[PDB]
């Protein structure tokens, strides 16, 4: 996160850390949508252009965390991965279209002050909230600059599709949105590398629940004027989410 601030404790209790076993390495963000299911970006698991194809056994999920590095004794919880699911139409070659993945946790987690799940938006909520100029929130333990001791946060405006589109030569897609400030706006902030899989969330003024609307997906540099962060449009992809999540018995 660039130009962000230290989160408060329990501020983002659905924050999930995607962690490589060996070498021990923090690799992405992710978010908790139930005791059992974690959402991240597909590129965090599978990205051929860079010979990345992680299997379940390569990775850990660390949940309830605040410190980036420090083990958090009766706070953080660790699960192995039962099964990874990448969207079937994830387009790593072109533009990280449908940059989304689910991870089913081997060891479901107990909710606490530090571990609680985020909501996924229904249609009405996505249409109401995912509107240009409305602000959402990104969190991660990602880089503070392109060139963090503690989880990072920043709120930022959704950008209109045309500004997003002319910001980049990468073919933009309806399963993405972008966000961040326009140069004339006089405020900064962005996700950056290692924030991916992390939640872009919005607090419904209607029921006061947090809804995850996007997933930190990509950008070009970080916090660059006239650039915006790109986000996997969670709701555009909720059909797949539902299908994978609804398949098994409790």
């Amino acid at each position: 996160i660039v130009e962000g601030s230290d989160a408060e404790i329990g501020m983002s209790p659905w924050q999930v850390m995607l962690f490589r076993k060996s070498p021990q390495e923090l690799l992405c963000g992710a978010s908790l949508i139930s005791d059992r299911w974690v959402l991240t970006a597909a590129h965090c698991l599978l990205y051929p252009p860079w010979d990345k194809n992680f299997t379940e056994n390569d990775l850990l999920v660390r949940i309830g965390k605040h410190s980036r590095t420090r083990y958090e004794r009766n706070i953080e919880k660790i699960s192995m991965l039962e099964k990874i699911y990448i969207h079937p139409r994830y387009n790593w070659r072109e533009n990280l279209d449908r940059d989304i993945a689910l991870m089913k946790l081997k060891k479901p987690v107990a909710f606490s002050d530090y571990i609680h799940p985020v909501c996924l938006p229904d249609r009405e909520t996505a249409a109401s909230l995912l509107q240009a100029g409305y602000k959402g929130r990104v969190t991660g333990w990602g880089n503070l600059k392109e060139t963090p001791s503690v989880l990072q946060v920043v709120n930022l405006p959704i950008v209109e599709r045309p500004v997003c589109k002319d910001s980049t030569r990468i073919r933009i897609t309806d399963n993405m949105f972008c966000a961040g400030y326009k140069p004339d706006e006089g405020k900064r902030g962005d996700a950056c590398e290692g924030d991916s899989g992390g939640p872009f969330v919005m607090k419904s003024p209607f029921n006061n629940r947090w809804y995850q609307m996007g997933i930190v997906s990509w950008g070009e540099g970080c916090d660059r004027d006239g650039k915006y962060g790109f986000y996997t449009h969670v709701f555009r992809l909720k059909k797949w989410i539902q299908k994978v999540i609804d398949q098994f018995g409790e």
Binding site: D113, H116, C119
Partner: peptide
């Protein structure tokens, strides 16, 4: 997940976080 998006340390305790209001006014 019927309790989703209500944070034990904020909503649940009727405390607001530091920067939450920014999101709320963005809707105006």
């Amino acid at each position: 997940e019927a309790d989703c998006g209500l944070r034990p340390l904020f909503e649940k305790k009727s405390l607001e976080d530091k920067t939450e209001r920014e999101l709320l006014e963005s809707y105006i």
